[model samples]
Target: KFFSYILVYRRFLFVVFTVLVLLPLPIVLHTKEAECAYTLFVVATFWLTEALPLSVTALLPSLMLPMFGIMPSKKVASAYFKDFHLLLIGVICLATSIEKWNLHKRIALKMVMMVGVNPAWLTLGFMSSTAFLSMWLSNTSTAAMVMPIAEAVVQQIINAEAEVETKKGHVTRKLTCLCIAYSSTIGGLTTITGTSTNLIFAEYFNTRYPDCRCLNFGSWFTFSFPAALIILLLSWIWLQWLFLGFNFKEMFTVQQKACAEVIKQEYQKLGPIRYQEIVTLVLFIIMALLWFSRDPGFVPGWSALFSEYPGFATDSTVALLIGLLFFLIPAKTLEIVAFDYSPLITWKEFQSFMPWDIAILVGGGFALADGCEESGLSKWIGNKLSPLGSLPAWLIILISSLMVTSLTEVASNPATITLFLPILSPLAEAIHVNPLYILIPSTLCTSFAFLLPVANPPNAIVFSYGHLKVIDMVKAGLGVNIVGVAVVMLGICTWIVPMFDLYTYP
Candidate 1:
């Protein structure tokens, strides 16, 4: 018992040692002005190496920064309520509801049935669902929701094929699983908030340019959604061409057989949709409409919407309202039954779900950024880069964004932003463009990581599924990273950014 207890406790000690001893070295050695910058560097390193939980990485900044006297309790506390937190919570709640209702699986099945299940269409449906779900929810949740259903679908295909011969069953199932995993990850890069780095970028942008207007929620979706969609479609084509090229006919035949049966069963079992489904669908539509109509001044964004409607549509309120209907509305009339709502998400449960460690790390990172600016450390760093000799603002922006994003894939993105934004914000100002032109796009692009397991929570969770290989991810992901970087650069520099009137060069 004693030995077992020691073994169980060993991992905990390792984490504590890493955080307390290893992490603070960078900050402690720096001059007061550079302390936060150094701390952020260390934080990023640990985060990307899987030395700690993503939430724990997020929470580190709060505790560390206050100790360094770089941030006050009040200022550090503000990091917890950043828009990313609200967005993350709201999105998670929506996703949880979807999971409860099995809407995602239904959607996937419906797609497979409607599209006739060619290898090309199967990949397309999977990738499209990933892109759509990732835009609103965390990539991990989206992937988790789809992964099981995908496994089930693939297993069913294999079982059906086994009727003829067992030899081909293994090959078909392995290929199907690989395709699903690849498509899910590829779709995560299409939006700023699709992964953690995007949110880090958003926070950094807000911090760097207090004056410039930024992308509101709706505008952000509009800017990145099309690019992501294009990339997802391209990915499907590429995967089909690369992996299933030789056995394409076999794959398509299997899928078509499976899909035909799925369609028939669904039609027979769920003849008419329940009123609850209708109610949930309506609520989702209303929320989505409000979410997207931040412009045109008709339906406001979250901030304005909450102000206008008061208690009716706050993020938590919206969640609870929909959740309540799930319990109140019966699925069948003769049963007179309430929905089996899980008590797992009561107030206590919800509070427990808060990534408190991440909250601390976020606070610390913000404090570090504040310290860098207050101590003139950013200016010192800027002086170092200034010797590059008058590079164009566009080039600088693109290079910096790419570099930061790359670094973030190996470090904590929030920490990367906390370190770089202080330096980059002034760099943009010195170059004579509105900071948003440089900062907004770069910040959003921070989440476009395509390398390694520790890059994001979703990546880590999906990796834990054990079906995906590291080489497979790296190979499939390279294209997404390339296309994604191109999309963000073009979208910001050429089109979506021009609407903000940030550029006025040549």
Candidate 2:
């Protein structure tokens, strides 16, 4: 009865917590810093409870910061827009072009056909293709694009089994759907552009420690791709054991051949790639090359080529340049037939595709981070958490990995990173440890939230397909989550320390 009352009055309880926390109850702490803490509490409570639209809740910092005298209005407002925000906009614009032209579909179908149709290999193929696409496109979009193809393959398998007078296996369908979902998530961890959480790490790292060498795009990809690949392999094995029952011989026979034919026919239906696809493909290649080569840590990157003018170029600059090219480069066939040589992507599409809510949400996180630093709240929190300094590095990473993985099961991954990184940055400083040692695992593990459909967009997209039950995901995902945490912990202790020189962090 008590639990039911609390459940019914949850919103009321959230308000009570907010008001009580914000009250100046005559505590002997720094007044301004305490105010910052209170604001954070309010925002976090609202964010966690989703009392309002997340973007709307994010705007609270703009109003509350100035009222609390934590920051000037203009300064607080400035946090809402930044280079990383623009970089996200540019990336989304390019993705819109890929989706609008159906270039994404063509690429996915081609990869599926190449991987063939053995059940295990087919699962690997779907996972691999989804992962590869998600490394560049949004994970949700990648999952959505891949699901239809997966469903089509499953239907073909069912039909083929009917013709052969054999019973259909439920495990095959569940495995395929779950594999695609998991792969899309794991793939996003490999690159900074792969997901919003990764870019949030980059944004915070640059803002907090501009001179830090280890957080650049090339270094991030170098350290993280191996871990992602390991997790993918382990997940594939685990899923096979749980769902496919290790009877590979029974699964990949003549019916699999028919499924392969279905994929081939789908690929054929796309016919020859068009001129627009070629243009988008070339632009995609160029954008990736520019981002990877911009400030690569080992070599003299292109950004350093103009030594006289430092900070002249950034990833956002390159992204915007490529995004601009989409408008200038016209599709030739459309040009000749219509006598109107319009650009590949138009303003209407840009306005529709751009996720301004997320952009605003990122800005709010930036504001919160800035307030924590300015108000001494981050350091204070660090001092409180300094007991963790005595723990072994591997253990610290393990704990952080587990916390992030668990919380992300219900919270937004980007918001989770946003809330934690500012606090972790100073915590690492107080503990005499490298911030990346704590921060990287926390950031990457947000993507490893495999326990629930609410954990990540890819999981939600796959769950909506009706092939998977809650228990099916829970059983499979729990194991994957455990394996993911183990891989991250191992990576942190072994490769990451030396790769980034964490012991000598300065």
Candidate 3:
């Protein structure tokens, strides 16, 4: 009986043991830093191990923080639903409308056609398409949407080749799925709301430097869009080289042409775009236009049109209203001017699609970060780590960049970023560095966890499809991880550093 079903119970038991011992170790080690340290440790272990759910692990802060005298119950409760969470919920609602109207697929299919259907180019276009879709849609949603289309492509092509489980077929399938998942993480850097980590950073930045408005949506898009573009292409070349090799003859093989034809037919299967597609398309365009024009920094944004006041209406709050826009917009706007109207999305759809646990998890993170500061751990850690303040700017960035991407592979992007946000600002303050200089590259590198399925949801999504083994992801991803670091350094040297005037702040 001791051996029976222990595999199932073993994880739970280990987690319980860790929490049980760690809870009292702070006593072994005080209310402020000691308790917060233990609470942080417990949450990290829980988040690291799949023994507990991510959101449920996230839930630890609420009880542990207050239970350990970290914060009041109300403050902890408020942390779960913050402005960052606000933007995510709002953007996701609009994203739901995009999916409901089948707009993403229509756009994705056209991308392949635009780039043509050869092996390398096909994977190239496919990754670029996922990048574009995920720039606004959640990385998870984008990966999920593309997985089926990718699977169909793989199946039909292999069927055409009459190769069942051949090396060529398996490699093609692995790249097909990997491109979808990895591209989203890359492109997600283009927008603050693209992924939760971006959103978390935005919040942490504002809270740390309330005087700075360094990263409004328009500026982020301007900076990251081009950087991500280069990285996506670089990754495309790497994946093509690693997976498909440089076989010129196989590029235009007869069976591959059949695969191209298959994709074209699937594109046609959608037929003409409907009124719904057109409406959602228009809405998405309008939304993006507003987002980009919100605060360009070089010039006043659309947000400046209404008033001189700066912080009154934030991107998150505006995004919330856009979410409202989806629910209020009717599918048939001018259909004989009917009194009753069906909206683009209903509450039922929003509720069905909403990721409730994600918000809770984020809240828990916010609570932990807050507890970190409240307990003075940020300053404390900063003091110890600030010995590196004497390091060169370039070297410091390399260190932070490596650590961010490496840490993210073991946990969610948001989780590692949350843990580090408290510490980065402290280092920045000590070194007299412009906070933007250190933070943006860290954020860029945060999205570079292409090496592991556990690194990010997109990788996890592709891995779950059974086309991949661990080594497949590792081989393709290792190069990208290194390349991602270089690009962040590259972006800073050529673009972001000059654009931000990074060295002047003292």
The C-alpha lDDT values of all candidates are 0.55, 0.71, 0.71
lDDT of 2 by residue, 249-301 (tens): 65545666766666667678879988888888888778777765764445777
Local accuracy of candidate 3 as per-residue lDDT tens digits, 248-324: 56655665566567667778888997988787667666665665566544567777676777667766676677678
Query: Tens digit of lDDT per residue, candidate 1, span 1-506?
Result: 98889788775766677656755555565545545665566567555455565456656666666776776757766655543344445444444445455555555455555663555455565566655665555554455446655655555444443333354554455455555454543343445445555656655556654564454566666666666666666666656654546454565456557547755575456556555546556756665554434322234456664476553543444444444444345444325457564431244433443344433444444444454455555556556765542886667767776676675554445556666776676766776677667676666566665565445434543543344355555675677677667766777766665566766631
Q: How many clashes in each candidate?
A: 20, 0, 1
For candidate 1, what's the RMSD?
7.8
10 residues in a row with least lDDT, candidate 3? 156-165
Q: Which order, best to worst by lDDT?
A: 2, 3, 1
- At residue 181, what lDDT does model 1 achieve? 50
Model 3 CA deviation exceeding 4 Å by range: 1-5, 21-24, 30-32, 112-119, 126-234, 237-254, 260-269, 332-340, 388-479, 486-506
Higher TM-score: candidate 1 or 2?
A: 2
Clashing pairs in 2: none
Q: List the residue pairs that clash in candidate 3.
A: 80-363
Off by over 4 Å in 2: 1-32, 116-229, 235-262, 332-340, 386-506
